[PDB]
């Protein structure tokens, strides 16, 4: 096996705003909800009736980094979703808690189909699998039948960044970095084609009905139209400068909605693409859309973006063309700086708001908000003589601060406890160890961590404790995310036992069996 390395994540206990990017969407009609996957790793529902004031119903924790896409399900009681982290979810969408945890991917899981007729959900990654998924066997997932049945389709020479499936559930159509579409029948699992055209990655597919037609979004700019039938390209489309990540088309598939790295969003019409509109100009490169098809034709169009908000433009009078859009979901700011002062201990941020903040890594907190001050001018002020050897590695890819311990370095940090900022009981001052306190108050909530007294049981470092609400994340380097949890909740009984399973033995080494090294 690969190493396992230790990460937290310095967060509120409420992020009820994206922190990120959104990578997908998804409409539950029904209910009028909205469904954000996050570059911050959550899962967010969201009210789309205009009367309610604060549209935020839920967030959906359990990802461990980017969530690529999501599928709503079985009348929206279901969420299927895909994450950076490796693994494929099933989501009770109606009450919003994850059910089960699918790790038959190797990598990234980067694309999920949906044939709503089988409710049947395809997933695709960086590992060039594909994996077809009974929705309902997974649904009737009990502890007692605990096996499911996977095929998988084979073919994909290349990390697979676009899946589709028609609504019968009779086509597949896959896009890679091989530039090419796949197409497998996958009832039978059998390759039908090899589509050639694009002359870079395919990012987006979406396919009418009968699977006999399918439109593809390339990164060299162009949108296509394939004819299965014919196995060729019929019509390709240049109306963006840049690639083109985002699809949607209308129900009658005669009009195509576009948008990718340029941030301009068109409606064209596959007929004469001559005739297109410019539905927006976007704030920033649009990521995935979502159609409104509450009528004919659509009145309005769902935007992600590599920001965190998430707006919708009206398209009626279609006949720029609106200025403003028409419902906004509020984002939060991401961290897009970060500066690690020579103590190896505090930081400062800077963040999408051009505020600035003072964080504590070993106590897994902020220290205080500076507000929009000079962040380089900042840092200069703040300088720390001092040397403190690497002991972590910090990562921005949430918007969130995520610090990882791994055991080569973890614990190459000794600071005397008064420069820390500590004291013992009677007037002392040890040598810590930076790593060791931190490993063991992440774990503090852990029963089998606990020393019986000679009353109170001694828990955790005895210097500090972490916020209870902060996550902490078990991992593969370079790997699958292998368990994640709270921590104030590693005293829960699965919680325990999973811990025990995962939790390696350089942890276990500090943190149970107390050899602080």
């Known amino acids: 096996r690969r190493k396992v390395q230790v990460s937290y994540v310095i967060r509120d206990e409420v992020e009820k705003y994206n922190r990120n990017?959104?990578?997908?969407?998804?409409?539950?009609?029904?209910?009028?909800?909205?469904?954000?996957?996050?570059?911050?790793?959550?899962?967010?529902?969201?009210?789309?009736?205009?009367?309610?004031?604060?549209?935020?119903?839920?967030?959906?924790?359990?990802?461990?980094?980017?969530?690529?896409?999501?599928?709503?399900?079985?009348?929206?009681?279901?969420?299927?979703?895909?994450?950076?982290?490796?693994?494929?979810?099933?989501?009770?969408?109606?009450?919003?808690?994850?059910?089960?945890?699918?790790?038959?991917?190797?990598?990234?899981?980067?694309?999920?189909?949906?044939?709503?007729?089988?409710?049947?959900?395809?997933?695709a990654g960086l590992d060039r699998q594909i994996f077809l998924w009974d929705v309902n066997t997974l649904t009737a997932l009990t502890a007692s039948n605990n096996t499911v049945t996977t095929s998988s389709l084979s073919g994909n020479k290349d990390s697979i960044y676009s899946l589709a499936m028609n609504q019968l559930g009779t086509i597949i159509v896959s896009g890679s970095t091989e530039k090419v579409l796949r197409v497998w029948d996958p009832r039978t699992c059998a390759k039908l084609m090899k589509l050639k055209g694009h002359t870079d990655n395919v990012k987006a597919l979406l396919l009418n009905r009968d699977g006999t037609q399918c439109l593809s979004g390339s990164s060299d700019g162009t949108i296509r139209l394939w004819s299965l039938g014919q196995q060729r390209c019929i019509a390709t489309y240049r109306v963006h400068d840049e690639g083109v990540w985002a699809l949607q088309v209308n129900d009658a598939?005669?009009?195509?909605?576009?948008?990718?790295?340029?941030?301009?969003?068109?409606?064209?019409?596959?007929?004469?693409?001559?005739?297109?509109?410019?539905i927006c100009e976007e704030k920033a490169p649009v990521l995935k859309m979502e159609l409104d098809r509450s009528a004919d034709p659509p009145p309005a169009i769902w935007v992600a973006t590599t920001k965190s908000t998430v707006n919708k433009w009206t398209l009626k009078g279609i006949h720029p063309l609106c200025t403003q859009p028409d419902q906004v979901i509020k984002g939060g700011a991401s961290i897009i700086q970060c500066h690690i002062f020579n103590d190896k201990r505090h930081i400062l941020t800077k963040d999408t708001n051009n505020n600035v903040a003072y964080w504590d890594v070993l106590k897994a907190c902020k220290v205080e908000d500076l507000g929009k001050?000079?962040?380089?001018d900042e840092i200069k002020k703040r300088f720390k003589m001092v040397y403190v050897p690497n002991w972590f590695s910090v990562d921005l890819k949430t918007g969130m601060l995520t610090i990882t311990l791994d055991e080569s370095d973890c614990f190459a940090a000794w600071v005397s406890?008064?420069?820390?900022?500590?004291?013992?009981?009677?007037?002392?001052?040890?040598?810590?160890?930076?790593?060791?306190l931190l490993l063991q108050a992440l774990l503090e909530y852990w029963p089998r961590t606990h020393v019986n007294p000679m009353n109170r049981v001694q828990k955790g470092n005895g210097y500090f404790q972490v916020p209870p609400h902060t996550p902490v994340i078990f991992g593969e380097a370079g790997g699958r995310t292998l368990f994640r949890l709270l921590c104030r909740d590693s005293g829960g009984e699965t919680e325990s036992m999973l811990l025990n399973e995962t939790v390696p033995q350089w942890v276990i080494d500090i943190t149970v069996d107390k050899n602080m090294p």
């Open 21 to 123: 990017g959104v990578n997908a969407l998804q409409l539950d009609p029904a209910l009028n909800r909205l469904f954000t996957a996050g570059r911050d790793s959550i899962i967010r529902i969201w009210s789309v009736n205009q009367h309610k004031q604060d549209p935020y119903i839920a967030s959906m924790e359990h990802h461990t980094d980017w969530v690529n896409d999501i599928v709503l399900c079985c009348n929206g009681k279901t969420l299927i979703s895909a994450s950076s982290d490796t693994t494929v979810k099933v989501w009770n969408a109606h009450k919003g808690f994850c059910m089960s945890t699918l790790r038959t991917h190797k990598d990234y899981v980067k694309a999920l189909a949906y044939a709503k007729d089988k409710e049947l959900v395809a997933s």
């Open 253 to 278: 598939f005669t009009h195509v909605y576009s948008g990718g790295r340029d941030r301009k969003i068109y409606c064209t019409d596959l007929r004469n693409p001559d005739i297109r509109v410019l």
């Open 373 to 376: 001050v000079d962040f380089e």
């Open 417 to 436: 406890a008064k420069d820390a900022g500590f004291s013992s009981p009677d007037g002392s001052d040890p040598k810590l160890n930076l790593g060791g």
